[PDB]
Design a protein around this ligand. Structure first.
Ligand SMILES: [Mg+2]
Ligand SMILES: [Mg+2]
Ligand SMILES: [Mg+2]
Ligand SMILES: [Mg+2]
Ligand SMILES: [Mg+2]
Ligand SMILES: [Mg+2]
Ligand SMILES: [Mg+2]
Ligand SMILES: [Mg+2]
Ligand SMILES: [Mg+2]
Ligand SMILES: [Mg+2]
Ligand SMILES: [Mg+2]
Ligand SMILES: [Mg+2]
Ligand SMILES: [Mg+2]
Ligand SMILES: [Mg+2]
Ligand SMILES: [Mg+2]
Ligand SMILES: [Mg+2]
Ligand SMILES: [Mg+2]
Ligand SMILES: [Mg+2]
Ligand SMILES: [Mg+2]
Ligand SMILES: [Mg+2]
Ligand SMILES: [Mg+2]
Ligand SMILES: [Mg+2]
Ligand SMILES: [Mg+2]
Ligand SMILES: [Mg+2]
Ligand SMILES: [Mg+2]
Ligand SMILES: [Mg+2]
Ligand SMILES: [Mg+2]
Ligand SMILES: [Mg+2]
Ligand SMILES: [Mg+2]
Ligand SMILES: [Mg+2]
Ligand SMILES: [Mg+2]
Ligand SMILES: [Mg+2]
Ligand SMILES: [Mg+2]
Ligand SMILES: [Mg+2]
Ligand SMILES: [Mg+2]
Ligand SMILES: [Mg+2]
Ligand SMILES: [Mg+2]
Ligand SMILES: [Mg+2]
Ligand SMILES: [Mg+2]
Ligand SMILES: [Mg+2]
Ligand SMILES: [Mg+2]
Ligand SMILES: [Mg+2]
Ligand SMILES: [Mg+2]
Ligand SMILES: [Mg+2]
Ligand SMILES: [Mg+2]
Ligand SMILES: [Mg+2]
Ligand SMILES: [Mg+2]
Ligand SMILES: [Mg+2]
Ligand SMILES: [Mg+2]
Ligand SMILES: [Mg+2]
Ligand SMILES: [Mg+2]
Ligand SMILES: [Mg+2]
Ligand SMILES: [Mg+2]
Ligand SMILES: [Mg+2]
Ligand SMILES: [Mg+2]
Ligand SMILES: [Mg+2]
Ligand SMILES: [Mg+2]
Ligand SMILES: [Mg+2]
Ligand SMILES: [Mg+2]
Ligand SMILES: [Mg+2]
Ligand SMILES: [Mg+2]
Ligand SMILES: [Mg+2]
Ligand SMILES: [Mg+2]
Ligand SMILES: [Mg+2]
Ligand SMILES: [Mg+2]
Ligand SMILES: [Mg+2]
Ligand SMILES: [Mg+2]
Ligand SMILES: [Mg+2]
Ligand SMILES: [Mg+2]
Ligand SMILES: [Mg+2]
Ligand SMILES: [Mg+2]
Ligand SMILES: [Mg+2]
Ligand SMILES: [Mg+2]
Ligand SMILES: [Mg+2]
Ligand SMILES: [Mg+2]
Ligand SMILES: [Mg+2]
Ligand SMILES: [Mg+2]
Ligand SMILES: [Mg+2]
Ligand SMILES: [Mg+2]
Ligand SMILES: [Mg+2]
Ligand SMILES: [Mg+2]
Ligand SMILES: [Mg+2]
Ligand SMILES: [Mg+2]
Lengths: 127, 205, 260
RNA sequence: GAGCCUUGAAGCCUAGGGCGCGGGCCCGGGUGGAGCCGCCGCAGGUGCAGAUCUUGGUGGUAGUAGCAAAUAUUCAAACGAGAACUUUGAAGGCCGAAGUGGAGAAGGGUUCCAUGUGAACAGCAGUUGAACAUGGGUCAGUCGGUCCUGAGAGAUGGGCG
RNA sequence: UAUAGGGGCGAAAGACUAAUCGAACCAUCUAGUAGCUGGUUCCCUCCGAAGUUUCCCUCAGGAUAGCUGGCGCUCUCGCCC
RNA sequence: CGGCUACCCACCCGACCCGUCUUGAAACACGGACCAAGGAGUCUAACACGUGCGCGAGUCGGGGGCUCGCACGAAAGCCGCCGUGGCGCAAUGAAGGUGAAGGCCGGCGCGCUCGCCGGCCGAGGUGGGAUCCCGAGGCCUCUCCAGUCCGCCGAGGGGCACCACCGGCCCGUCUCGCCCGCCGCGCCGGGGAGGUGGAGCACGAGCGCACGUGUUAGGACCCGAAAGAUGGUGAACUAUG
RNA sequence: CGCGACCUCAGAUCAGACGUGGCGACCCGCUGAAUUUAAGCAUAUUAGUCAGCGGAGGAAAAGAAACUAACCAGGAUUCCCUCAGUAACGGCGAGUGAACAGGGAAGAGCCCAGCGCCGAAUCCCCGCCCCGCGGGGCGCGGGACAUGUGGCGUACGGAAGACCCGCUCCCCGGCGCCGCUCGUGGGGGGCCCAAGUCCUUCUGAUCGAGGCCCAGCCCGUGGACGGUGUGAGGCCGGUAGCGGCCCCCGGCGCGCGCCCGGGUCUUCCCGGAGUCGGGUUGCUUGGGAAUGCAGCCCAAAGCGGGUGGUAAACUCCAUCUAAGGCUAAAUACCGGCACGAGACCGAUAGUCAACAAGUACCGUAAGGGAAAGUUGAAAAGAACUUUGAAGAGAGAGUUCAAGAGGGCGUGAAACCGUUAAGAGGUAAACGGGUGGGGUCCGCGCAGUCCGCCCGGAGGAUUCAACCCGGCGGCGGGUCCGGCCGUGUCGGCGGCCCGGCGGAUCUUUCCCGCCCCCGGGGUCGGCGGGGGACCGUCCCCCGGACCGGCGACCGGCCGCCGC
RNA sequence: CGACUCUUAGCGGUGGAUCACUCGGCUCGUGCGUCGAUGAAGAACGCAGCUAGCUGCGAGAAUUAAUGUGAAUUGCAGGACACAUUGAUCAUCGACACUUCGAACGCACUUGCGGCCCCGGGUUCCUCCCGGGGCUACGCCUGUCUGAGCGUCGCUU
């Protein structure tokens, strides 16, 4: 139950801060859980996403065991795009299909210096 | 406009009252503000008690209220001199100084003096250095409590006399009749005209 | 509303200009010019005799009735047929007025709390509250009040030591002190008979706090227990005691209907 | 109410089945796509035929009145899906120098000009236009403002407030 | 370029003063006032009028009695008067 | 085969279009072309009365203080050496002021249209008056004795509420009268008996909360004027320099 | 005549510094109506308010009595409840309308002119060093203010001076640093529990069902959000004296600067003027024989002046010291800055403005001022074919749906088109009564009734009748076993190792004092402490009473399932 | 029989009611309490690769620097994709910068007319010559400089 007098239970204010949060908060909102073997290996529940991961879909019309690479991230649309997930139009042109990143399981990361630092902050805080 | 047997109404509403209505809605918020102000005062002072200055013993001034007794304002510099202490030193000690107050009553004079002697007895002070002109040991474990509540020595203490038992005597129950008040009242009303007729009888030679 | 719907300026037209005698906005070009101005029956006028922020919201009750209602609610919480007739689950629960040990109020973890309720068999009642926490029906979903959730057992205690941290987020539960009672917690919805769970020191402190009929209450100054209207009140017992049935006329039971 | 529902709630329609004396309600059928009700209490901005009511919409009147002030058009051809109106030719006319001419002041603000479209606008139509869309156009020592004072207006000094 | 609203101007019509003038226009006081017109939204049950006295710068209105309804209360019945 | 139905049609009889002002409406009286949505006795203060609840000669915390900073907590709880205060418990006078106990018996002073003393009881009495109590007598299968038990009672007793009247008491005035008191002997107090004015007393019933109705002030059921004041904007039409 | 000194003055693009303009919700100063009310309307009321003008800050204003009172007296200002709808004002009509006592919240007092004492002991400007940073403050020489009056000592509560006695010898500001510190200083960012496990629906599932005796998992986290719907665990966050980094801030310790107060006694000093007040006239007030304010005129005093509520005189008493000034708090706040909530409205509502809203637009201008939310989960927005000059269409395709096709959710009524049925001279429509047809429902269509008991034809089971064994419950009794319950006494037991009440008492007691003659004396009084007495609830056994929803056991009666 | 008219009902159209949703209002309360000559509020004009509004900015114009953040903005191209350099975007924002009008300030407003001082080029220089910079409003205070007065006064002719 909410105990701060400085955070809102209010539906209007929460939806407004959600749909108008800037990009460096939209990164935190578009966050994905890690697979259970990788959370065993790294001791961390969730991470922000980027351009270069290896991604499996857990629910949708496109489900199960299809570990592909992300290519674009519209933070404006709260949508990532996956390389295997396609659909043709009428005119035979393929187009990526929108997947919200809560329905996304990360199987491999892209390792980088800031990702090592974020991962170490997660492990140090989970303690 | 009126009706059957009903009381004459003269309400005061012809003035445009709906503009200037100040309404108590911030009353719980003011109660919380004033609690936080008092707790902030208690933490901001020190060992000094809350409602810090001591208050005298003072009788009301109206044939209606003179039986009672009231926590007054200050100690009436004659009384504070009989206490044997200087003026602003009393303001630093925590003794209220009100120089306009006069003392006609030797009884309330001595009662204020007794209250001063009791406060000077209960006083525990701390100088800065180790000179310790006024002080002592580990002074009652920081006097075992830091802060007091609702007046220092409970300034009301409305004193109650008993007049327990006595044997009825004579003279009184043959003497103290109703007619004493009426004869004294007529004496007070006619105190002047009797003196004027005395001066007339002296003039008529 | 607190502000005018009279932001518009307005005049009437009169007996000429056939339409009406409502005030009208004056202007041109913009197609509000000539519509209905302030009033009730118009578009964008003030509501009739509008709400004002000095309405008499709060109401005062006498303190003796405030205490009387607490005594009546606690007395209604003691009878088993009342509290089952509200909707709790006391079918497999031990005694009515539950009173656990003082080891309870020193809890720190909530798993011990769930274990305590499961062994006291009120967990069926908690399971009902889990079963019924549906979404609100109505227009109230917009204004921050979305979960209908029924009230469960209220745990009453004194000398707070950490029982609030333990019992706090079990859903539907009520945690509530002795020296600060609530009618809004002891009878939610204005119906008497909410199930309650007590504690040893609390359940001993009750008779200090309200007294018996023989001695006055010690903690509350001027307050006695209430007067009692009918002393023994089993009406079947009274009517079938022999002192009444000595002095009854007769059972007259012939119907004597209409004769044609 | 261990209420009801994506196995379909609210709302809407219903030559369907009923209940109540009624206020109204219950079910069936079809649409419909995500919330809804019964009961005990409680609190209201709480129930429509009207107020020459307000706002929004649509009828009858009706394919009717009406597209008539200033004489007036006709033929052939072209581009075009399409020509009583566009353009060219020919013919016949009008304005007739106090003009339906040639240029300006105030006002308008891109309407000026070319190209392309003809959906809406031009009260019929249009291949056309001042419509829409794209892209262009206003060059000054000697033309005028700038300078002068006029009728006046207005500031400091002063006075009043 | 001058004159501005009880003000201006008028060869004088009470004309003109931005389609308004026997007192312009705009906003506010303002939801001004009205014994005077118009309307005043669900059902059923029960009871059910008055248009008369007196007084009022009262005669289209109100107060007063009278008429009505509701709330009751105090008694009376049931078992030769 | 049965079926009421807001389906449709036939036929007989009844059948004027609604709302309101009005003595009178179908009116040649006014408003209404049709449809959907909005649209009008609300809220506060104050008073009166009825109703429900709690406490009761009291009652009320509505203003403050007390609890750890916890969603619901702008809640709830407590104060009582916080009752200050409101309303009531005592009225009456313009005011100075004054301010509600009598009854029954014994005795005395001339028991004199008069006062004092002693004892006891205690809000007087009359007529009605729900109820209650007592009760002659009355009735229950052989004749005697029996108890509860049964029920009607003529009549009698005490008598609630309330009604009607008389008597009593307080205060203001008016009239007629004599006596007492003495922080001081006076244009000083106190007293008696009648007839009157009073929103009085004559064993107190209020206070708080809530609901209902009515009345009043508020924009107050909703809309409606010709006006008035304050402060500003206009001589591009027109008037005249 | 010149020069010098001032005094009055001007000038400057002199050196340096300052004011203007805005917002105006609250505050301050002035000015100032009228609608309305009184059923008319002149005073009154509306109101010293709307409008106007000038100012100000985070608050402002007020403020340390020229006071309240009249008795056992209080004591600056502010704000609340009361006072009180009262005293009072009023064509004594409508109406208007205080204040001191009382209880609270907050607590705070001071300085200067005058008077006199100190040899101008004072301040500003310029110039050089002094010092350390993020950045400016003490000291040394010369130009001024100023003797028509800087500074110190000084304020009506008395003050000063000089003896005498008695002590005391100081504090504020600047700098480095340690833990601090009431939410666990303030701000800024980044992070912190646990299932997307299994079947099953579906367009998609956050649906439904399930998880051992450890209750599948976490809970100081089950608020709320978004994600193809309705989530404690998929994600942000929520919880926590949860942890880390960065900044600034309020209360300890080295340097610089400043530093004799109290009591008695003696002498001396001691106050604000065109101001109060009076007359008169206007405004305002509840203020009446003038509360306050202002104009004009008259205009003082020193045991004075003002106030003491009915004008004036004489008199006594009380209280205060005006015409100079400063100051936090409690308090108001619809503007602003963020912020949190709601028995509030849900697009004709709520601000006029949910959207390119003070926008489009109207008027020359003052100014007036709108309409307008919704595809779908995802644009996947209809490829391609094929008529038509194109709009438009028919096939095809997208998706669960085009019955969602770009103002596109749901799509009502008025109205219109078409189909299906019926009908037609008294305009149509209605009520009562039927009849005919139609849509549709039910019924099974001369086969529709069911349930119990009793008498007959079959098998298959095992009660029951009777007893044994066992559990649980009913109903009563000795109130047995005890228990508690109701009353009355005994023990006062806990009275001091008991709660509380009492304007019962106890000076035979104790402490601070006062009284009488350093002590004693009840000679008496007050404040404070104990303890005898009554009034209730805590025990003991003994006896009275009842087994009452106060419940257990034994035996009895009588059921029960196995 | 048809046409017309009427009433029902199915379907279709016009129409945009009801219902459901809500980045919006309204009310209450807490915390804070801040503009301007060092040029405010307001207004005008301008600015994107494709650009009209809204929004955000000022000739450095859809933002510059710095701190935090850590791989994007997005309708479409491109461009830096660099990150074992400095590191995209977004927020914070304390350093820079801030066109013209506006209390508006050189005098007025018609973008007009000036006047000094200083610096670069001119005739290598003043005499109404180009570019750039600075200064040039009113009122008032403290001090400086200049000087008016048969105002008062001295010493002198
Ligand atoms: Mg909200
Ligand atoms: Mg009436
Ligand atoms: Mg009156
Ligand atoms: Mg008014
Ligand atoms: Mg208004
Ligand atoms: Mg208005
Ligand atoms: Mg509105
Ligand atoms: Mg609804
Ligand atoms: Mg939807
Ligand atoms: Mg319902
Ligand atoms: Mg319903
Ligand atoms: Mg509502
Ligand atoms: Mg309404
Ligand atoms: Mg209607
Ligand atoms: Mg009607
Ligand atoms: Mg109409
Ligand atoms: Mg209309
Ligand atoms: Mg029409
Ligand atoms: Mg014709
Ligand atoms: Mg025609
Ligand atoms: Mg023509
Ligand atoms: Mg051709
Ligand atoms: Mg041709
Ligand atoms: Mg033609
Ligand atoms: Mg001609
Ligand atoms: Mg011409
Ligand atoms: Mg046309
Ligand atoms: Mg062309
Ligand atoms: Mg052209
Ligand atoms: Mg165009
Ligand atoms: Mg040339
Ligand atoms: Mg020329
Ligand atoms: Mg002038
Ligand atoms: Mg001037
Ligand atoms: Mg006028
Ligand atoms: Mg005209
Ligand atoms: Mg009205
Ligand atoms: Mg009006
Ligand atoms: Mg009459
Ligand atoms: Mg009656
Ligand atoms: Mg009439
Ligand atoms: Mg008539
Ligand atoms: Mg009629
Ligand atoms: Mg009519
Ligand atoms: Mg009509
Ligand atoms: Mg409606
Ligand atoms: Mg009552
Ligand atoms: Mg009292
Ligand atoms: Mg008038
Ligand atoms: Mg006028
Ligand atoms: Mg004027
Ligand atoms: Mg002109
Ligand atoms: Mg009138
Ligand atoms: Mg009039
Ligand atoms: Mg006035
Ligand atoms: Mg104003
Ligand atoms: Mg200003
Ligand atoms: Mg400010
Ligand atoms: Mg003073
Ligand atoms: Mg009163
Ligand atoms: Mg007044
Ligand atoms: Mg969700
Ligand atoms: Mg969620
Ligand atoms: Mg998480
Ligand atoms: Mg007056
Ligand atoms: Mg004096
Ligand atoms: Mg005097
Ligand atoms: Mg005097
Ligand atoms: Mg003063
Ligand atoms: Mg002063
Ligand atoms: Mg203050
Ligand atoms: Mg809508
Ligand atoms: Mg609107
Ligand atoms: Mg979508
Ligand atoms: Mg569907
Ligand atoms: Mg739809
Ligand atoms: Mg749709
Ligand atoms: Mg037909
Ligand atoms: Mg349809
Ligand atoms: Mg619309
Ligand atoms: Mg950069
Ligand atoms: Mg200027
Ligand atoms: Mg320059």
């Amino acid at each position: 139950m909410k105990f701060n007098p400085f955070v809102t239970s209010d539906r209007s204010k929460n939806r407004k801060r959600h749909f108008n949060a800037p990009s460096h908060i939209r990164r935190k909102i578009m966050s994905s859980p890690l697979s259970k073997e990788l959370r065993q290996k790294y001791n961390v529940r969730s991470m922000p996403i980027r351009k270069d991961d290896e991604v499996q879909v857990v629910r949708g019309h496109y489900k199960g065991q299809q570990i592909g690479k992300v290519v674009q991230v519209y933070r404006k649309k709260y949508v990532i795009y996956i390389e295997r997930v396609q659909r043709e139009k009428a005119n035979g042109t393929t187009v990526h299909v929108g997947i919200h990143p809560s329905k996304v399981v990360i199987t491999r990361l892209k390792l980088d210096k800031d990702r090592k630092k974020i991962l170490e902050r997660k492990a140090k805080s989970r303690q | 406009a009126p009706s059957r047997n009903g009381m004459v109404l003269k309400p005061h509403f012809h003035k445009d009252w709906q503009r200037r209505v100040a309404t108590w809605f911030n009353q719980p918020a003011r109660k919380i503000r004033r609690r936080k102000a008092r707790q902030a005062k208690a933490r901001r002072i020190a060992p000094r008690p809350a409602s810090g200055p001591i208050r005298p013993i003072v009788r009301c001034p109206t044939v209606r209220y003179h039986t009672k007794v009231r926590a007054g304002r200050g100690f009436s510099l004659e009384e504070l001199r009989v206490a044997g202490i200087h003026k602003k030193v009393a303001r630093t000690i925590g003794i209220s100084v009100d120089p306009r107050r006069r003392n006609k009553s030797t009884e309330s004079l001595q009662a204020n003096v007794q209250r001063l002697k009791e406060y000077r007895s209960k006083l525990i002070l701390f100088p800065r250095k180790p000179s310790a002109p006024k002080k002592g040991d580990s002074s009652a474990e920081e006097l075992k409590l830091a802060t007091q509540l609702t007046g220092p020595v409970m300034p009301v203490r409305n004193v109650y006399k008993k007049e327990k038992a006595r044997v009825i005597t004579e003279e009184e129950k043959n003497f103290k009749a109703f007619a004493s008040l009426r004869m004294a009242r007529a004496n007070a009303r006619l105190f002047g005209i009797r003196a004027k007729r005395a001066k007339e009888a002296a003039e008529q030679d | 509303s607190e502000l005018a719907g009279h932001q518009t300026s307005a005049e009437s037209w009169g007996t000429g200009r056939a339409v009406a005698r409502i005030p009208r906005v004056r202007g041109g070009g913009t197609h509000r010019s000539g519509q209905g101005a302030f009033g009730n029956m118009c578009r964008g006028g003030r509501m009739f005799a509008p709400t004002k922020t000095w309405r008499r919201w709060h109401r005062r009750v006498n303190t003796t009735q405030k205490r009387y209602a607490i005594c009546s609610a606690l007395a209604a919480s003691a009878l088993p047929a009342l509290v089952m007739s509200k909707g709790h689950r006391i079918e497999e629960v031990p005694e009515l007025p539950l009173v656990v040990e003082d080891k309870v109020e020193g809890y720190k973890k909530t798993k011990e709390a769930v274990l305590l309720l499961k062994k006291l068999k009120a967990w069926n009642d908690i399971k009902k509250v889990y079963a019924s926490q549906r979404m609100r029906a109505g227009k109230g979903k917009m204004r921050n009040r979305r979960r209908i959730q029924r009230r469960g057992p209220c745990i009453i205690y004194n000398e707070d030591n950490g029982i609030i941290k333990a019992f706090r987020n079990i859903p539907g539960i009520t945690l509530l002190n002795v020296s600060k009672l609530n009618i809004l917690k002891l009878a939610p919805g204005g119906h008497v008979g909410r199930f309650c769970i007590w504690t040893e020191s609390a359940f001993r402190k009750l008779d200090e706090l309200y007294g018996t009929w023989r001695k006055a209450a010690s903690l509350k100054s001027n307050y006695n227990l209430p007067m009692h209207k009918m002393i023994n009140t089993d009406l079947s017992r009274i009517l079938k005691s022999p002192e009444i049935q000595r002095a009854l006329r007769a059972p007259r039971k012939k119907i004597h209907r209409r004769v044609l």
